[PDB]
Amino acid sequence: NIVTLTRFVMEEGRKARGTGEMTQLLNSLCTAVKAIHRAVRKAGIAHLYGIAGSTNVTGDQVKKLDVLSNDLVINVLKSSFATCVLVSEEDKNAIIVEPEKRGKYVVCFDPLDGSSNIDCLVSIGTIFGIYRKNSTDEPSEKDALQPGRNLVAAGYALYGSATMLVLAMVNGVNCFMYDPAIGEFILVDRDVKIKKKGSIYSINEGYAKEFDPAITEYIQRKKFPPDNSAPYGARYVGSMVADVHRTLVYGGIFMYPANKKSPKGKLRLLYECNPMAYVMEKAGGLATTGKEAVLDIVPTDIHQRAPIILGSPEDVTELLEIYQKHA
Amino acid sequence: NIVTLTRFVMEEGRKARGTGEMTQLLNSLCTAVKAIHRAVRKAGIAHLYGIAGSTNVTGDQVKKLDVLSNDLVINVLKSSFATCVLVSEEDKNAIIVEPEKRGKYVVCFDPLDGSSNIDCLVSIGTIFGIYRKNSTDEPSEKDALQPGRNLVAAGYALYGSATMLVLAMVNGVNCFMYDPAIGEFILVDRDVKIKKKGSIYSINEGYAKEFDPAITEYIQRKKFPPDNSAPYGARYVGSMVADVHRTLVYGGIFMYPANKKSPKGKLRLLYECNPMAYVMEKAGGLATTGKEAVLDIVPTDIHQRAPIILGSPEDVTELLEIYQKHA
Amino acid sequence: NIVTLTRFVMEEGRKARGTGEMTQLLNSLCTAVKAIHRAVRKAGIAHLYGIAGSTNVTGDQVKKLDVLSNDLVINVLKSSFATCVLVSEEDKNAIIVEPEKRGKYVVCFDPLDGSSNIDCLVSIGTIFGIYRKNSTDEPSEKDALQPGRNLVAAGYALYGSATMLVLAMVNGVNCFMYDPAIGEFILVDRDVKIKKKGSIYSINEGYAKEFDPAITEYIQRKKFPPDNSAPYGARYVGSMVADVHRTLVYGGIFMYPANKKSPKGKLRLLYECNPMAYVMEKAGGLATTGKEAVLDIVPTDIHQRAPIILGSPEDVTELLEIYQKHA
Amino acid sequence: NIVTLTRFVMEEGRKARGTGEMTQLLNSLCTAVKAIHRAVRKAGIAHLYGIAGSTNVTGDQVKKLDVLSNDLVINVLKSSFATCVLVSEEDKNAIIVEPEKRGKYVVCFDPLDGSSNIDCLVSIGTIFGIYRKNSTDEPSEKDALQPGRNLVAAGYALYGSATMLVLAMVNGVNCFMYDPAIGEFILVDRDVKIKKKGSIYSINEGYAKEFDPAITEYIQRKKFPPDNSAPYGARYVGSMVADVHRTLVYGGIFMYPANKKSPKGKLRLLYECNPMAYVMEKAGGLATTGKEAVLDIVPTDIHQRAPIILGSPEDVTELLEIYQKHA
Ligand SMILES: Nc1ncnc2c1ncn2[C@@H]1O[C@H](COP(=O)(O)O)[C@@H](O)[C@H]1O
Ligand SMILES: Nc1ncnc2c1ncn2[C@@H]1O[C@H](COP(=O)(O)O)[C@@H](O)[C@H]1O
Ligand SMILES: Nc1ncnc2c1ncn2[C@H]1OC(COP(=O)(O)O)[C@@H](O)[C@H]1O
Ligand SMILES: Nc1ncnc2c1ncn2[C@H]1OC(COP(=O)(O)O)[C@@H](O)[C@H]1O
Ligand SMILES: O=P(O)(O)OC[C@H]1O[C@](O)(CO)[C@@H](O)[C@@H]1O
Ligand SMILES: O=P(O)(O)OC[C@H]1O[C@](O)(CO)[C@@H](O)[C@@H]1O
Ligand SMILES: O=P(O)(O)OC[C@H]1O[C@](O)(CO)[C@@H](O)[C@@H]1O
Ligand SMILES: O=P(O)(O)OC[C@H]1O[C@](O)(CO)[C@@H](O)[C@@H]1O
Ligand SMILES: [Mg+2]
Ligand SMILES: [Mg+2]
Ligand SMILES: [Mg+2]
Ligand SMILES: [Mg+2]
């Protein structure tokens, strides 16, 4: 038997004895993801280059892919009737959903990640994280500032050679391939685990001058293992969804450490760092800042940043050992 | 006026007063790429996961993505009645087209490049090179053993977030964006030129222990620049087509130099290095082994390898100088 | 706010305080419908004409569109875990679902209707009807023989210029357009009603020699109104989903009466006549055999036939009056 | 060997030693049809129902399906640099192409036929006719006023369950099936001929009160055959392209004769009757007004009408005889 994402969500929802609100939320985000998909693969681009004529602009003015993505997400989610607060890397402040549509959930997301990679046609993705609104008082940005450990569900869609949605909840990580022919996500990999140890390290080595001595020591090892083993391969697409997914599937390690110009890392805690740490932990891997677990940070600002190192348990443990040795 | 690859090729072919053969070939390649695109993006995969069960395929039958790609390109090209010799990365020997389907052109291609990125859903592409037959002899491999400078047409398809076909001929390099909604490649950038200088270097640094003194020195310069400039960013997707395109479009530099596991480099000269060299040069960029222009190497083995350094001219020459110096 | 079919079903299911079994059933049938869609619009047909080569057959042997359609339906439904008995115009006997997958519902369907229209590329569709298994004893074909009035839900998908799914349940009829770009059904028409009286009659007049005096009288009227009003237009696609849908949307009347060679009508009670009568009644229209309501017939055989006349209330009432006058 | 319309047109064009102009035109038409197909099948309609909300279109802006079709065909054809005069059903006057984009061909087309079937999702199509300029004069309407027998190429696209492009030139009629998955029309039937005799008649019988004695008599014969044969089946989709195609492929007969509301018939001679007449005759069939071959009528008004009777030869002549007799 074949399992579509829609079917899976409904079962999980049925097992968990949900009132159907969370299920609706995931169906929506699934719908959202499929629309972004289409916009990202450039369907109907021929209209932007005057196939039907009547055209005054080869210009900025039309939505960039990012502004489109954000709107799809915001709208589709609001329309699920399951949210009360949304946070988006694209909006300075949290969106508070009108009372008429207010549901019990909070969502943090990055509508289109790997924007540096958009123009070159590289892989780009969508990252989400969902919390249960704990507080009883009016919804506000503070409902977003819950540590990673409170995630009910988190995941990403990767728009690469093909589209994949990865979804992580309390009992594990599942990969659904997208068949755009029928517009359905198929479960192709179940109860996903990352290998204990990989043979690939990912980090922008252009920052070598800015790295702390640990990162420096670690990278040295991978190239010149003291034990004269085979050196790790390097890979860095420049899009976090692409680099992280490759990590989940092939194993190894991904780094975005603090670097002297980015004393607090670059990636965003709530919609970039959080979801991924959650996926990595539910998959048997680790996610640390170098000195603590991402999931445990008590966030203070919805666009706060954080260093992050995630991936195969042994590969990260090895770097945490270098850090403690750097006392 | 919107331009479609079909119209571009026909137009160019008319200007050149061609007899129609090479146009036919180019339309074929184009048809083939569309086909591969579909497979790559996994449309119809639901039928691999039993959506209709298995009674369907009486057979033992299904295709790896790479094999399907190769059957597509072969059949499609053969079908064009324009080729006589074909070289695929996938076959041990040049393929000699049957007399009935034989045309005067020689096509070297990699039907699906970046295969270590296939199972992670990272970017992949198809790479092609076209020549005119240079003998009156029965067609054989000798006909595919020409130097890059004799190419008539070469380019690639990048199956990334969106799909792009880049085509290079004597008069320059044009990029066509695939609009899957209506099945057409739309000319989106015309008579393309690479930035003289770039800000990104692209190379698998895990082979550090194996690089020659020049690549090593050059690498240091990008991380710790002598002018005390900002360092270059690093990007290495793992897929030659994806990494090379980002280079053409943002500028900078891509490297795959020699290493002990490969002394003569990794990438293939005929269907990998050659075509990308032809695009780079038509785009105002440089393509060297570090000692020679890649396009001037007269091959002697269809699966021969070569070291490749390509990208923006100031960048490649800065490295060529490092070589010239050490020598 | 936009309403996808998936979202609608989940709400209705939520209101009705369902245990989620029926919802899953509709999600499945929705998935089923989307797959048939793709097969019907001939996606990937290029493989049937040797685009990738390797081909021994321009032949029967591969599935006809019908055999594919049936399998998609059967499988997808069984996999919803909500059915215990299925009836399909394509299977002599009812399918009894294995206990491991046995759910509480019964489904009667015609995977691809308008098979006479398949070769000419005319509109073809899918028709379904769902019952609640009433009996407490082992599931068997007798669970299918419930009169139309017991339908929990019924509808059809029309594969025409565009794909539409029409769905009818206790509180009304809703039309969802299919956006194959995102693979979603959008609610574009809500709480649908048929107009009281239309200006189009549909029936195969080739059978004029076989018709009863009522049908004959009625057709006379439409052409030569005694009251010297404008005569009705004629329309008959030859595909029941296409003709019926046009009736729902534009109003008027559709006929498939008994004709001397088909003394019991042609269309099938359970998967052809039933669902449509149900849609028509929930839309304010009528569905009679000429002497009684379709929905009220107590069926005796799962492939039993029945005459049927459906459409605008006044238009049908007019023909029921001719019948009683023909005493 | 699989044949794609792109390859078929190029091949045919080479055989004819054309200069490439007419091929370019044909590729354009083909590109246009793909475009219309997308619109017709409602891909991206979700964006009309606020999937991303409305901030999107700052405008007052959206297109009826018929208008979009007409903008596509015009722009696309213009863009081919092959046309000088265009006649669209949608415009009051012939369109004279600007001197810069002017080619030697004249195109008459109906960009979306069967519009009373549009809102019911029934089959619709595009119909085209191509001529060569017959003067040395400044191009004007006079150039579109040629008899059907001077056509160079004509055909249609049927947007039904699947999409088919049928193309007719001096050497015969070929059908290409659209495979939306990869955007290509595949030649599926070659050098097509209609059955000499058919078993289906197609006509709006609501105009019974208005038909001439011959159409009436012929109609009776199909329902009550004098040889006491089985009666013909009836089929009238309401869309000329859909009804005519079924005719070409199953054989039989299609009629749109004179009625008081139309004395000179309904269908247009230039862009409706002409092209379908050209296909029918190339396919071995007949196309009469009832008094003349349709192809021999020299038009005097681009939007002129004509009665049309077409189909299998034994069928049309049987009716022509009824006419000859009454006369
Ligand atoms: N589809 C689902 N998948 C997993 N857990 C769910 C689902 N629906 C509900 N739950 C669980 O039930 C809680 C609330 O249910 P609800 O009222 O449906 O949102 C969530 O916080 C989850 O723990
Ligand atoms: N999605 C739904 N839409 C409409 N009615 C429903 C739905 N789900 C359940 N129901 C009602 O609840 C009954 C059984 O619910 P269930 O156990 O979910 O199948 C059905 O017979 C319907 O009357
Ligand atoms: N579509 C095209 N684009 C660019 N150069 C072309 C094209 N077609 C032919 N050429 C030429 O490259 C050639 C080979 O010619 P032919 O045998 O006509 O295919 C020269 O004939 C030039 O006309
Ligand atoms: N693709 C084609 N299919 C059929 N006939 C064609 C085609 N192209 C041109 N013809 C011709 O119809 C003509 C008009 O020629 P041209 O000016 O070359 O477009 C004659 O030249 C024939 O060669
Ligand atoms: O150029 P840099 O600093 O390596 O940025 C790459 C990172 O930037 C981001 O785009 C920031 O959102 C991530 O997706 C990616 O990991
Ligand atoms: O791990 P490596 O040696 O960098 O391999 C990367 C290269 O391998 C290939 O997959 C082999 O062609 C190229 O696409 C890519 O540039
Ligand atoms: O040729 P006939 O008898 O009019 O058949 C048309 C009818 O046949 C069917 O295909 C029978 O299933 C219906 O879809 C349609 O109404
Ligand atoms: O209702 P009527 O007059 O039969 O109209 C049907 C005809 O009208 C049109 O829509 C007008 O072109 C044709 O496609 C079709 O053949
Ligand atoms: Mg990001
Ligand atoms: Mg390769
Ligand atoms: Mg049927
Ligand atoms: Mg018309």
Short mmCIF file of N, CA, C and O and ligand atoms in Angstrom, two decimals, chain D residues 89 110 112-115 125 127 240-241 267-268 271-272, ligand 12:
data_model
loop_
_atom_site.label_atom_id
_atom_site.label_comp_id
_atom_site.label_asym_id
_atom_site.label_seq_id
_atom_site.Cartn_x
_atom_site.Cartn_y
_atom_site.Cartn_z
N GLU D 89 -11.67 35.55 -35.61
CA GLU D 89 -13.06 35.67 -35.30
C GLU D 89 -13.27 36.81 -34.31
O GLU D 89 -14.35 37.39 -34.24
N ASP D 110 -9.77 30.72 -35.58
CA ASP D 110 -10.72 30.92 -34.48
C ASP D 110 -9.91 30.51 -33.23
O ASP D 110 -9.57 29.34 -33.08
N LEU D 112 -10.64 30.20 -30.08
CA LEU D 112 -11.29 29.30 -29.11
C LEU D 112 -12.72 29.00 -29.53
O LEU D 112 -13.62 29.79 -29.26
N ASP D 113 -12.92 27.88 -30.19
CA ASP D 113 -14.21 27.56 -30.69
C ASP D 113 -14.95 26.60 -29.78
O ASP D 113 -14.34 25.69 -29.20
N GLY D 114 -16.27 26.80 -29.70
CA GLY D 114 -17.18 25.99 -28.89
C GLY D 114 -17.43 26.70 -27.59
O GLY D 114 -17.33 26.10 -26.52
N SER D 115 -17.72 27.99 -27.66
CA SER D 115 -17.72 28.83 -26.46
C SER D 115 -18.95 28.65 -25.59
O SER D 115 -18.92 28.98 -24.40
N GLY D 125 -11.61 23.94 -28.92
CA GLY D 125 -10.47 23.80 -29.78
C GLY D 125 -10.11 25.07 -30.44
O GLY D 125 -10.77 25.99 -30.27
N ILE D 127 -8.90 26.63 -34.28
CA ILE D 127 -9.02 26.26 -35.69
C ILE D 127 -8.24 27.25 -36.52
O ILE D 127 -8.39 28.47 -36.29
N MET D 240 -17.87 22.63 -32.70
CA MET D 240 -17.43 22.18 -34.03
C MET D 240 -16.11 21.35 -34.06
O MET D 240 -16.03 20.29 -34.72
N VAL D 241 -15.08 21.81 -33.37
CA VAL D 241 -13.83 21.02 -33.35
C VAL D 241 -14.05 19.63 -32.76
O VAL D 241 -13.57 18.66 -33.29
N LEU D 267 -21.93 28.80 -39.04
CA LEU D 267 -20.48 28.77 -39.03
C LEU D 267 -19.78 29.65 -40.06
O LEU D 267 -20.24 29.82 -41.17
N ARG D 268 -18.65 30.21 -39.66
CA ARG D 268 -17.89 31.11 -40.48
C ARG D 268 -17.10 30.37 -41.55
O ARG D 268 -16.55 29.29 -41.32
N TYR D 271 -12.62 30.89 -41.03
CA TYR D 271 -11.92 30.30 -39.94
C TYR D 271 -12.65 29.17 -39.29
O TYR D 271 -12.22 28.69 -38.29
N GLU D 272 -13.74 28.71 -39.87
CA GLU D 272 -14.46 27.57 -39.30
C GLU D 272 -14.67 26.48 -40.33
O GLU D 272 -14.16 25.37 -40.21
MG MG E 12 -16.01 29.02 -33.62
#
